[PDB]
Design a protein around this ligand. Structure first.
Ligand code: CL
Ligand code: CL
Ligand code: CL
Ligand code: MG
Ligand code: MG
Length: 264
């Protein structure tokens, strides 16, 4: 059987709920102790086991407060998750890529033993909002050893991500006027290889700031993607293939994917 499975068999309601089946704890990461990023919060399951680990970045002028709900929710499904602050709130995407990587390595090596003992350091993922989503793409290109990448309403001036092989779910917002899907999220998705595991999910009725307030669709598909690719958990394939692929009014404007997904 797959040794990385955690939690009960999933349902729609379980994934749409405010929290998953794991109670969570928090560890503050001081700015002074945070090496190579601005600090942040680590959310982790109280139950002693090993889990995959995830770092999440905000965007320009943003703080961890704009992503905290999502890091806590993902951790409650069985992940160790750090929501970062950046060195300055104005850092550019390629700098945020570095900082996401530094945050992964902080969790693995420099957090409390309570946190470090809960991490499988071989199973890592990154996510981020807007310029933090651009940073997610850049880090994925640098680190094909990541198990998953989830850019949220991403922003980057580089439109060509044709080397990336990390399983990548891009979440766009139909009404985004700041990182429009026409010039950011869709070109990024279209440039990813056809031969990798990838998906594009466009939220319906959503602005650029949809990732900054609790969202049941972002939570559902972020957790299903992380389960499928960080944990190789094929109990979550059913949510992603074929996925919400004809739209779902007020939920999903469009969904594209390279289903079926190769299994590691
Ligand atoms: Cl941004
Ligand atoms: Cl917007
Ligand atoms: Cl399929
Ligand atoms: Mg702090
Ligand atoms: Mg729409």
């Amino acid at each position: 059987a797959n040794p990385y499975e955690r939690g009960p068999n999933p349902t729609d309601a379980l994934l749409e709920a405010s929290s998953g089946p794991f109670s969570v704890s928090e560890e503050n990461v001081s700015r002074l102790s945070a090496s190579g990023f601005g600090g942040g919060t680590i959310y982790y399951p109280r139950e002693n086991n090993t889990y995959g680990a995830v770092a999440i970045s905000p965007g320009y002028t943003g703080t961890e407060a704009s992503i905290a709900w999502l890091g806590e929710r993902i951790a409650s499904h069985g992940f160790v998750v750090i929501t970062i602050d950046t060195i300055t709130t104005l850092d550019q995407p390629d700098s945020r890529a570095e900082q996401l990587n530094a945050a992964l390595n902080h969790m693995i090596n420099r957090a409390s033993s309570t946190v470090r003992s809960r991490i499988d350091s071989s199973r890592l993922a990154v996510m981020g909002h807007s310029m933090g989503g651009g940073g997610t793409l850049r880090l994925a290109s640098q680190r094909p050893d990541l198990k998953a990448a989830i850019p949220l309403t991403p922003w980057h001036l580089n439109k060509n991500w044709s080397s990336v092989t990390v399983p990548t779910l891009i979440i766009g917002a139909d009404l985004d006027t700041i990182a429009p899907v026409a010039t950011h999220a869709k070109p990024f998705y279209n440039s990813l290889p056809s031969s990798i595991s990838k998906a594009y999910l466009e939220l319906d009725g959503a602005t650029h700031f949809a990732p900054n307030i609790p969202n049941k669709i972002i939570g559902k598909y972020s957790v299903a993607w992380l389960k499928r690719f960080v944990d190789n958990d094929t109990r979550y394939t059913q949510f992603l293939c074929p996925g919400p692929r004809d739209g779902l009014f007020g939920e999903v404007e469009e969904y594209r994917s390279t289903c079926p997904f190769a299994l590691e």
